Design a binder for this molecule. Structure first.
Ligand SMILES: Nc1ncnc2c1ncn2CC(=O)NCCc1ccc(S(N)(=O)=O)cc1
Ligand SMILES: [Zn+2]
Length: 257
């Protein structure tokens, strides 16, 4: 099955998922000088005060924190979106070294990691129906650079030792995703895809201009996780990012001058 190694990595995915070579694939390079400022874009509305985190899980390609999406508790609206999108989960993509790990790039610059907050359009009732729609999902992407620690991330990194290998999970309640957001909600947006199989072309991407800073000790804890299950040869969970895909007939818009 698919992964991030030499023999099953991103250059192989198109064999099982031919949409990998489609017209609106993600991630992409964000050319900041070619993005078009669109003063008709609204501010993003991030309403996370009633978020209910449930569990944290090593799924073999990342780790994810999952939320109760049975009600409008933590929702994204506005920006380029029509309607209301419910937070399902967040996860990260990261590198073996600090100069790579993000999926999106900015003027070809790679960041150490990229946070994805995954939301689905309540129009479609469940995330399985939403992935089959061109406007089914909205993913909020946030870049991580290495420097000062992000205090709001520490509760996450401290439990990773308990989900080291594929398939492990743990309860993970009362985690507040607002402690992962940067000051500014200035963003770029473009139509795209999931960055892991099935690579469905169902995502409105909203990528924040301002990265968050995390400490070296925080990102090193990411790099101790395992792709493998317990009892298999240890393969560190690093470089779990898809590289930039061709922009083709798309324009990236900016909410900011
Ligand atoms: N816990 C849950 N409850 C209900 N349904 C759930 C679920 N977990 C998974 N499903 C199905 C699902 O979500 N498929 C989409 C997977 C996805 C891929 C890549 C990106 S990415 N890298 O583009 O952001 C983001 C999301
Ligand atoms: Zn992702």
């Amino acid at each position: 099955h698919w992964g991030y190694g030499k023999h099953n990595g991103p250059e192989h995915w198109h064999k099982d998922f031919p949409i990998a070579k489609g017209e609106r694939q993600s991630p992409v390079d964000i050319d900041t000088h070619t993005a078009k400022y669109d003063p008709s874009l609204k501010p993003l509305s991030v309403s996370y005060d009633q978020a209910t985190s449930l569990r944290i899980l090593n799924n073999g390609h990342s780790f994810q924190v999952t939320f109760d999406d049975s009600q409008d508790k933590a929702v994204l609206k506005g920006g380029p979106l029509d309607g209301t999108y419910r937070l399902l989960q967040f996860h990260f993509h990261w590198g073996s070294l600090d100069g790579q790990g993000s999926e999106h790039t900015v003027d070809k610059k790679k960041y150490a990691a990229e946070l994805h907050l995954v939301h689905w359009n309540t129009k479609y009732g469940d995330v399985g129906k939403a992935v089959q729609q061109p406007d089914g999902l909205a993913v909020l992407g946030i870049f991580l650079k290495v420097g000062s620690a992000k205090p709001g991330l520490q509760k996450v990194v401290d439990v990773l030792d308990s989900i080291k290998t594929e398939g492990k999970s743990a309860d993970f309640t009362n985690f507040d995703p607002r402690g992962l957001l940067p000051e500014s909600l200035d963003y770029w947006t473009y139509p795209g895809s999931l960055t892991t199989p099935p690579l469905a072309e169902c995502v409105t991407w909203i990528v924040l201009k301002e990265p968050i800073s995390v400490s070296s000790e925080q990102v090193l804890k990411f790099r101790k996780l395992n792709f493998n299950g317990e009892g298999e040869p240890e393969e560190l969970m690093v470089d779990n990012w898809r590289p930039a895909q061709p922009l083709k007939n798309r324009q990236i818009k900016a909410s900011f001058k």
